[PDB]
Amino acid sequence: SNMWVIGKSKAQDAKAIMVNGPQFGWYAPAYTYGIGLHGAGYDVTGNTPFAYPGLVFGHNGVISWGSTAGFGDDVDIFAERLSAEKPGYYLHNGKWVKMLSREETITVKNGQAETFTVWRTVHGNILQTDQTTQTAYAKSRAWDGKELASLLAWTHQMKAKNWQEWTQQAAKQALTINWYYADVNGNIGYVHTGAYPDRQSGHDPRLPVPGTGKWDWKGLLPFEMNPKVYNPQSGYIANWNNSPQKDYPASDLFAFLWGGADRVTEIDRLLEQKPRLTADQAWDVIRQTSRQDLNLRLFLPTLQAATSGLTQSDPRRQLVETLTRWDGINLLNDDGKTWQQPGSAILNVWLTSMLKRTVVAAVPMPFDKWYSASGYETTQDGPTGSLNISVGAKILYEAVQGDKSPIPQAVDLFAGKPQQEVVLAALEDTWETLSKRYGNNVSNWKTPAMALTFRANNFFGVPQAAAEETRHQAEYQNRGTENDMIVFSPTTSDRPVLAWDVVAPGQSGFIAPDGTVDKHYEDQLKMYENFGRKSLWLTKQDVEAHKESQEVLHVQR
Amino acid sequence: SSSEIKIVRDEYGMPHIYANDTWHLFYGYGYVVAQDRLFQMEMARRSTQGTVAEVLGKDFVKFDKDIRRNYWPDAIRAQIAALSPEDMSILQGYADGMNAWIDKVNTNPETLLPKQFNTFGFTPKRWEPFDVAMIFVGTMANRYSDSTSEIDNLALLTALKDKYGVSQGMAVFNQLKWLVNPSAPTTIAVQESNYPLKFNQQNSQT
């Protein structure tokens, strides 16, 4: 998920601009739901996932808000000590304590029901895997018992009218989420919200801890610790699931890293490139980042150095010149199937080869597999989510940075070999592979483009529509499942705020019994495709002027 | 009228609810959700509670079991029971609004039942605050805030120490899975602030 908030010092023809592109995957019907609420202290417009009571993407005419997953480390694992003699108990603070347990029955269509038991300790529910007569692992969330509070915090924040009222709600949201603020006066803000544990001294949060007691969390860190900024000197706030703040530790996931290589640099670059940006230019950042190859910028210098001293006819050198002339912005050919330039295919093959010769070669099997993905992997349906720099690539990047990397290279990923030789050997593989496939005339290479699918099964893999409802889009775009922009104090409008979004395929998922699809079933699909957007209304007069239907209910609780 | 709920839909079918109190406002919200996304929401409810197999069969049993092992329904219910009347009104209203539409749907299914229900062979049932709460718990908190691989991490560290020895093994883990990396581009610039906490990165819990 990406987000850029542009404040007063950098907004052109406006005081603040917020552009959010949450990356939830693509589904039919739409992942989010458009809704406006007017009364009982609320006055808001926007759209939100699964129609949560609280709008994750929206505004109230005074402030606007958005989110991207924070990926902080708010979960630790406790290795409980068991005993064969006391089934259902675990040792904790010197005593054998009784686990919580419940019976569940999975009823099954056209099948036999299944009954099983779920177990929980003071640290959280027990994991099925990694079980032994002596050990069971509990999953401990800093947000345990704060589910409802987070749901309400996300709702109540909608009524905030300034930074102080908003951060008050942000402090109650316990999940690890980045929250963003903007307002009519041009103020902008950011909070890496969530509950985070106050860990014992000596507790390495990347590894499990004994559950017998001495390693229990002290409590939760206070809100003062949560990374936050209000009106930053930079004049902008940009995020793409990258680190919130210097020295802030990431999620413990082995496939997740905040390092020198980060896709967020792609956004910082476009915001810094122009002193001030208009709403239209800020929106345009979606189109550009959604087509930007994310590895070009990181490895190009390494690629140039390695081939800088080769003759002109060297095919390795020429693959690099090709990359050098490229902006890295993929476009479709007239065929709607292939990319105008072969750069991503080149980088993909080369990177895959580099990882296998380096990081992969240094890690013991089968962990080595964790570091072999190039980040271009996909199926014929295209990516299920965003495109990112792979974990191996991030590690590889520290290595090619040499002494400029702050990470001590305990082991040499290049294993004594000069970096240039290994980079060349990988360029050799790339040329052999690609030339064998497309021929020796690079300029006519028509490599496969990624496509995009709005899936009929939800993220769980559960149908939420019939299979035939799947929608297809020729061009994959590394962008939000939805995109909304809020523009405060636009100088060319009669309103103090303007707002747009796109909810594809459409607002409605309804199909009548006879198969007649709703009028709003697919009216936003082509709009999504061409980086279009429609207006979000807020005031009574705007909603009224754009009304298509109206219905009044009379009900008493 | 305190009992009046007005629903106005714009050029894209997007609903705007107008109401006086908390309960009526979210009643309207639930009502339009049931009009727009009933099947999608029904299957979402089932995914977040692990009751998909009830309607889709044996291929979803493992899935159902995994869902149920990952939360504790009673704790969620207790959080709801501790809610103030105003907060409860949000969840109750929303559930009631859905129920109003669902009742109309099951009263005249020949014209209002979304086709998918006929296709998959079942009809929609009423909602309660628990259900609404679990939509959020199951699709936000569990999908995006429940990540850890500590067990795998210790496994990797253990292999590294076997291969490279203890001291070097620890050093390589800190090279492939660093705790922090000062060159990481951050949303908040260093000029503004830094995180003041330092963490053990030697697995000293052992």
Ligand SMILES: C[C@@H](C(=O)O)c1ccccc1
């Ligand atoms: C899609 C997900 C993310 O950024 O990974 C997310 C979670 C919560 C709010 C916005 C986006």
Ligand SMILES: [Ca+2]
């Ligand atoms: Ca952890």
